[PDB]
Design a protein around this ligand. Structure first.
Ligand code: XMK
Ligand code: CA
Lengths: 235, 51
């Protein structure tokens, strides 16, 4: 997360972290409910075996609100492929349930129609993660959050060097030095409506971080709703 | 009517079924008596910051 603020107490409770053997965060996720985590399919490749961590805001000083959960089964979308990064989405079924407490709570899944017309037509959305605070620096120790304006679907395609599929959308800034970065992928893209937040996207990819002229590419959640429900019933 | 006005005065989901407005809520919430407001049925309802 280049630029942006720090997630203060309880501000980003639906945030999740995928940790590897080394116990280091390599990707993000979004807590959907006590048993399921939302993430990007391409993150399932960046690690041998992994577990997820909730209620963690500082990777250094142990916070009693933390918990580690093992994965029971990963539902990765078949249509996904690294060449196009299309269908960059996946749902995780946890072995033990998540104890919702402060800094640990689920994000609401919206209705498809309502979201596309009310949620994604809002000016901004919020993205967060423990990823790099710079294109070359190292993984962040603190959980950050960034207000990212929605990007006109057209500008998105023009600025982009790759095929922006209908399963993706742009968010970020053209010049301002703010956008997600490595390690942030898989994280939550949420939109705010009357103090209640809704999952809207999955930190997917970009051509670098906060590059002038480029934007952050996010998996369009509203385009996989029915798929997510199916997954929460496992399939 | 007109979920476009101001979301039809709903708290969350807004549907225009028939001629009128029709509000609803995310899982974990129950529609209020006024059929507009959404009410949490648990200590940690989705989309709410634990402040
Ligand atoms: O700097 S990064 O670490 C990313 C940080 C970041 C920033 C914003 C967001 Cl919302 C998410 C992630 N780096 C850049 C290059 N790509 C690798 C690229 C390989 C080619 N590519 C596509 C996309 C669509 N069709 C065909 C090819 C995109 C990805 C790997 C990773
Ligand atoms: Ca900690």
């Amino acid at each position: 997360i280049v630029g942006g603020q720090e997630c203060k107490d309880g501000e980003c409770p639906w945030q999740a972290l995928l940790i590897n053997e080394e116990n280091e965060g390599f990707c993000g996720g979004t807590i959907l409910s006590e048993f399921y985590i939302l993430t990007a399919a391409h993150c399932l490749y960046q690690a041998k075996r992994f577990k997820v961590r909730v209620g963690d805001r500082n990777t250094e000083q142990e916070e009693g609100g933390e918990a580690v959960h093992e994965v029971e089964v990963v539902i990765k979308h078949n249509r996904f492929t690294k060449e196009t990064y299309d269908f960059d989405i996946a749902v995780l079924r946890l072995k033990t349930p998540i104890t919702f407490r402060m800094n640990v709570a689920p994000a609401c899944l919206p209705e498809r129609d309502w979201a596309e017309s009310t949620l994604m037509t809002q000016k901004t959305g919020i993205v967060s993660g423990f990823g790099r605070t710079h294109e070359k620096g190292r993984q962040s120790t603190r959980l950050k959050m960034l207000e990212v304006p929605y990007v006109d679907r057209n500008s998105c395609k023009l600025s982009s060097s790759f095929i922006i599929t209908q399963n993706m959308f742009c968010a970020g800034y053209d010049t301002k030095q703010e956008d997600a970065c490595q390690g942030d992928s898989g994280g939550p893209h949420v939109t705010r409506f009357k103090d209640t937040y809704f999952v809207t996207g999955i930190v997917s990819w970009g051509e670098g971080c906060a590059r002038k002229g480029k934007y952050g590419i996010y998996t369009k959640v509203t385009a996989f709703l029915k798929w997510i429900d199916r997954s929460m019933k496992t399939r | 009517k007109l979920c476009s006005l101001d979301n039809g005065d709903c708290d969350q989901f807004c549907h225009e079924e028939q001629n009128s407005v029709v509000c609803s809520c995310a899982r974990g919430y129950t529609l209020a008596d006024n059929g507009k407001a959404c009410i949490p049925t648990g200590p940690y309802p989705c989309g709410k910051q634990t402040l």
